[PDB]
Amino acid sequence: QGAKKLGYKFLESLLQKDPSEVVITLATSLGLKELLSHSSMKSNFLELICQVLRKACSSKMDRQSVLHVLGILKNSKFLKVCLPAYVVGMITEPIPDIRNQYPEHISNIISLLQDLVSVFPASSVQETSMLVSLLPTSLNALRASGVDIEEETEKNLEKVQTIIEHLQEKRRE
Amino acid sequence: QGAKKLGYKFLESLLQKDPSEVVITLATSLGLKELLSHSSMKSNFLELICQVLRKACSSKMDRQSVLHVLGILKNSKFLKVCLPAYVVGMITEPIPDIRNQYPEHISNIISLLQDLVSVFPASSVQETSMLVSLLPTSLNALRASGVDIEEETEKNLEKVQTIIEHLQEKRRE
């Protein structure tokens, strides 16, 4: 029933399942493309979608489903427009409660970036480059505004930055 | 007559006029909004539009027309989606002739950013912040790939970065 027009409550219930169930539910869902086809979205819905995609694409068992989900993710307005706009919108957030919760979503975004640079390195260069170019600015803005960042998050961002830099360098020629 | 449905040839002819004529033609054109409502565009058309906006919004005579043109520009998909993607696409350009022409369009983009941060500082913080966060990466990529950058361009980008940083700082509280 709701396995097509994936709603907020449906994804909330689906997140509790194990990564295999989540990735197989998303890969066989018709509305996944329509789920990520929004350039504008609420913060809560975007964070839930990022959590669900982080958990699903981490499935070290269902390669074809992760492939399908990441292939839909890389060509979606969610990754191209919505996520960069949200990362930029982190800088002008006055409320401290949301600024303190931002690091978890940043970690989820960096994990999805690693997934993209490992599964679709050649065709997802532009989107991952835009996101890894926008992330350090919001990280410095949150670090200066009291919000602490986990060191592992910085390590992962530097790793994905190195991979993306090498892919851009090898595409320049 | 043909001043609506702003086409490539119309903007090519209009660019030769003085800044007052250009800005008044754009402000009184119905299709201006529909001209900038494209998230995807050709390189030549985007560069022509950026040149036209640089020349028009430089008009130190017609304040109302510059206000209208910049107000349409700040809320358009051209500035939100098209220009950041175009700036990111500079890094993976193999052709050297286009990489060598990029600095002029970068200077035009920085000039439009100065226009936005001086005319609409409060409401255009997000869009100008995304572009001033994406520009130094493509500048480093072009500087490493042999393409030289003008010193005045770097000065202007650092100035607009300082203004945007202070606006974000004053929006955090």
Curated annotation (Swiss-Prot), chains A, B:
Superkingdom of the organism of origin: Eukaryota
Cystine connections: none
Tissues of expression: Widely expressed.
Coiled-coil intervals: 148-173
Subcellular location: Mitochondrion outer membrane; Cytoplasm, Stress granule
Function of the protein: RNA-binding protein that initiates the antiviral response and is required to restrict the replication of RNA viruses. Acts as a double-stranded RNA (dsRNA) sensor that recognizes viral RNA and then interacts with MAVS to initiate the type I interferon response. Also required for immunity against some bacteria, such as mycobacteria.
Family under the similarity heading: Belongs to the ZNFX1 family.
Associated disorder: Immunodeficiency 91 and hyperinflammation: An autosomal recessive disorder characterized by immunodeficiency, recurrent infections, and hyperinflammation with systemic involvement. Most patients eventually develop hepatic or renal failure, may have compromised neurologic function, lymphadenopathy or hepatosplenomegaly. Early death often occurs due to multiorgan failure.
SUBUNIT field: Interacts with MAVS.
Protein name from the UniProt record: NFX1-type zinc finger-containing protein 1
Gene name linked to the record: ZNFX1
